Symmetry: D2
Amino acid sequence: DVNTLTRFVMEEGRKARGTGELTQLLNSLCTAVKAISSAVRKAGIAHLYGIAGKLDVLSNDLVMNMLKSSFATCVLVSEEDKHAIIVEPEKRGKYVVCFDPLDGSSNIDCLVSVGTIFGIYRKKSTDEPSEKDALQPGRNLVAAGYALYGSATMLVLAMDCGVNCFMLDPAIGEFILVDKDVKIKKKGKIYSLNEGYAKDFDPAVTEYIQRKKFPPDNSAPYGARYVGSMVADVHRTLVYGGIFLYPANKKSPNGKLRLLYECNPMAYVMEKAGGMATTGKEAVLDVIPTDIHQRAPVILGSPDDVLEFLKVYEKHS
Amino acid sequence: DVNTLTRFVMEEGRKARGTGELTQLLNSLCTAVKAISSAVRKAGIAHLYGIAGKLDVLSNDLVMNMLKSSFATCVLVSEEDKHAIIVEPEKRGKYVVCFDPLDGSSNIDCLVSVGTIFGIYRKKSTDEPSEKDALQPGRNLVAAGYALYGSATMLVLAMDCGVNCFMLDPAIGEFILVDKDVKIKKKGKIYSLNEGYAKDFDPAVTEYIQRKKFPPDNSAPYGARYVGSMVADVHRTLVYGGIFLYPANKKSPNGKLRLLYECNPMAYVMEKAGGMATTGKEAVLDVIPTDIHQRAPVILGSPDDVLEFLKVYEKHS
Amino acid sequence: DVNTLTRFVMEEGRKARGTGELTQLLNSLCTAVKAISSAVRKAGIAHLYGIAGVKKLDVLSNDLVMNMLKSSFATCVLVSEEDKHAIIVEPEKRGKYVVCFDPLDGSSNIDCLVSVGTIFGIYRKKSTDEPSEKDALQPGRNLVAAGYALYGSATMLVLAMDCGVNCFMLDPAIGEFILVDKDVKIKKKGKIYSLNEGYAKDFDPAVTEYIQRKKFPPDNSAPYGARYVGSMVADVHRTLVYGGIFLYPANKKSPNGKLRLLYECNPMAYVMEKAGGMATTGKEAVLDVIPTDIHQRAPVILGSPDDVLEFLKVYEKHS
Amino acid sequence: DVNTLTRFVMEEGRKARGTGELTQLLNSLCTAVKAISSAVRKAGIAHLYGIAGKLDVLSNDLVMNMLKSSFATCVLVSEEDKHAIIVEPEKRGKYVVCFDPLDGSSNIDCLVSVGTIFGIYRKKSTDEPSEKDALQPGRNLVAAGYALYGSATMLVLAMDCGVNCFMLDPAIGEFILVDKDVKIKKKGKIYSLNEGYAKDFDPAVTEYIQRKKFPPDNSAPYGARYVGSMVADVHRTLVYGGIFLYPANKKSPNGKLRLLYECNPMAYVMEKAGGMATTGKEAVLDVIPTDIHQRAPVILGSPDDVLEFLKVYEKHS
Ligand SMILES: COCCc1sc(S(=O)(=O)NC(=O)Nc2cc(Br)cc(N3CCOCC3)n2)cc1C
Ligand SMILES: COCCc1sc(S(=O)(=O)NC(=O)Nc2cc(Br)cc(N3CCOCC3)n2)cc1C
Ligand SMILES: COCCc1sc(S(=O)(=O)NC(=O)Nc2cc(Br)cc(N3CCOCC3)n2)cc1C
Ligand SMILES: COCCc1sc(S(=O)(=O)NC(=O)Nc2cc(Br)cc(N3CCOCC3)n2)cc1C
């Protein structure tokens, strides 16, 4: 039986018999994702170059405006905005959304994969809405996922029921369900990190990476892949198995990836698909944030690969 | 003034006062690339999943059929075909085309960027067309380039006039001229290779990559990027500068990449854009091939970076 | 504030506190309309003509609407211009709604790239008996929702419900139906009549005199213009947008008209009246005819209220 | 073998051994039509309605700007411009183009089919170009045709070699050759005109239409179709056979349609397809214009049906 993103959410939304705000939120998010994909693929670029005589800004504006107008959100945290956006009272709903509207777009000059990352919370305090409402642990996520604008445009959605993948058919502008209840391999064969920071690695990371290239059990060495765009890297890990690392280094002593709208949604997806996501010291999903743009070190992926790293991490205290 | 690929090629053909076969060839290849792109982006996937009731093969068939029906070709070498394809006599034209119809498609399941690589040679003799007509060194190339099916679709075309980049506007199916006569940085800050096989590196490769991570002076260590799809990694090298390595080692004395439809067209693009491309022992374009599928090692990118590799390469010779 | 078909239906559905089957029905129908649109605009035809080396459009349209409706879990009986008998949804997929639809109206002239369209009307199931074809023999008055997709110069979905008529433009760049005309109402009186005057030799006397009055007005006013696309969805949408009258009247050779009551006349009569217009068979309201055959025909005269009344004045003059 | 608009034109130009200007002309117009098609189908209308926060004017600008930049034209006559546009000197070529960029657009609110019509003349003298270059009889046409934005988008091109029909494949942005060397039926079964203006008909039109509803020889009456969009009605006459009339009456002694960029290109398309096109008194292509916007009555279509009209016209002298 064919399924679309909209029918899938609505059917899951009917079973839960909730208020319907989460469905309008996700439906609006889906529309923004299609608009972003169309602009990322350069639809209408001929008009910019004079056939008749900024991208991350457009993406943020698309997501901001579809979310505000859904009547489903109250607080919006974006990589593009310094402060949280408080939805005006007539459009206020009960959900908090943290999102990177176009992650990896700093390198978009080379047509590298980019993506949108999002995490959805139910507002937790009864106070008037403020930035504090987005400072929740990832354990509290109601919904999370990403759209990868890669060779094709895919939407990965994780909820309590698990992880589902939707391929965007651009001929009809519909998200088609193609991979139901996806689960990551117990053990992968690809590790993913920027080895250029090798001079600033902590000893556990140095030793773990050494074990991937020169296995102590004479097994096959892992291959390395690092796209430099987090959505593309995490999606490859989920589909192929393996491990993704962005640990702390000298230029980024608290890590580089953002906890609210990069690490937590990926940690959410990883855990619902049977993977792991750790900072080294604790679960990514267990970090309680204090700042909306705060950074975190992150190691995620197939459980055997993350546990093997934690085993090495504990060797170094 | 707005410019498209089709208007552009024709204007180059009129200046050159050629027979027009090469213009018909490039226009045919452009139509194939637009068809491949539509398929990579999953147009019509809704019909596959039962809404109303092969990707490397199709790419090959699109290029093959558009090339044969251009009346501009006589011999076709494909990554997908064991022997060269001899165009039937009624359709024979004067050019020889080597191509990879969908490079990177082994990992297309994770929606990594893929691409089409192509190199166009003039047939050299009036003898009956045969595979021997493809055994020319890359130096004899009349035209070469690639299509990157990335976050957007771009066609990079190199001729005697230089390297030009065309963006595909999917709204109108036209390739828009966006980067004229592009030149690679004299020196970059990114190195690209699969570091997972460090256990099998040539010792010279080991020392070179160590220098990128641990510079003996006070310069910045390079960042690492490796998509694992050649078109994307080389295109990132062209736009940003840096170095791309798929080198020879002991276990693979000739490298892994294919010379005719991976190494040569890219080596040609690099050199017309002011880069360098070497096997370690000689320039890629100078290798005389003896097998249409023979492998070659390739190291290309910014010239200062390739020369630094050659300096390390000679230290171990 | 931007609004979409999906957003619009869902919040209207939330207000009503209904079961949600109607929204999943409408959302599925939206998906079929976009897939039909893609095929009508000839997406992928290069492959038909051998770019690398399959089914007729009205067959594909029927399969798209049929399959999207069945898989919505919202329908029980489906009546199609393409199928002799009503289709009874299998039990595991059954919902409480009856949908009559024309999957691709006007396709007789699709070789000339004429405007084509999809027509649809949605009913509620009335009895607790096992679902059967007679559940589709309800009068148009019983319509829960009705509308059409017009595949013209652009693709528009016109949706009529109790809250009124709303028009949605398909933006193909993002595959979204954009609300562009809220609460549409037809002009009180128009300047265009629509019918096939080539068959005037077989006209009933009332139609002949009414068309005579349109070309040679007895009050020496300006004559109406004539437009006839020959594609029903295009002609009726022009009537709604510009005003005037659309006629497919009964004659001696076709005393019950030629258009089909369930999936052409009833949905169009529903849209017209929700937009403040009229639609009559000559003898009665289109929406009041109680059908006895799912493919039974009805004559139809619709459009602006003053133009239909002027027709009816002529109709009664001829008994 | 598959054929495209671009490949088809190029092969015709090679056979003729021309300067290439006419090929560069047609290729630019082909791109303008694809851009018009995209806007007509309402690409990007969501951005007009605030998803992130005229049409014939745009169409004129697209045609004007693609033709100017083709370097193949010197004089442009448009339904949208009162005076002819004289191409700037660096961009001047030897061809004169008359075009209606978006015909039927007054009724575009009801989504009636619309279209672009064009006729191409060679220039008249080496003197500095002027509007006088557009005052040619239709007989002097080098090429003419139309794009119909109907249920799908089709381009009909007429040259000395005949009439060919090209379908726009919107998934790849190519015009695919679908109807080669089309020939109109000798006799049709549909007549097309605005019967609402019957009070002012000349007796010949009155008597001819009478013959279509009430055949004196016991034949079947013709059907009536009138869309109100000239490209749509004329395309139907070509595809199904029959007759289209926008004739002269007392209030419009020269008709309503414009001779240079509505009547003449259609008469040329008709005559190259074996049909006829008359004003009643003479063949449309034989009218020598004295004003670029002068009107002409037109009756075109299947030859038996036009000849039938003419004898009714001559019966009334
Ligand atoms: C982890 O949880 C994720 C699961 C959830 S819950 C939500 S929700 O909160 O938006 N709820 C609803 O959309 N509900 C809903 C929707 C429709 Br259609 C009909 C009805 N019914 C009307 C008749 O009476 C019964 C309820 N309800 C979305 C998702 C994906
Ligand atoms: C090393 O740079 C190669 C550059 C080249 S050459 C070719 S080509 O081989 O296809 N040739 C032509 O397209 N020729 C051509 C085209 C047109 Br339109 C008109 C004329 N005419 C000759 C002059 O008189 C008028 C007619 N010629 C393609 C490219 C990209
Ligand atoms: C004919 O025009 C009538 C208008 C109607 S009614 C229907 S419906 O029947 O499909 N029902 C619903 O859509 N219901 C619905 C949907 C969502 Br989301 C949430 C909730 N609620 C959850 C919270 O608790 C209350 C119910 N309900 C569709 C239309 C367009
Ligand atoms: C009105 O129907 C006439 C048909 C015509 S003529 C023209 S044209 O005027 O633009 N000319 C050319 O396109 N010429 C041309 C094009 C190419 Br590619 C190569 C060469 N070569 C020069 C000769 O040696 C071989 C190479 N020439 C277009 C059309 C469609």
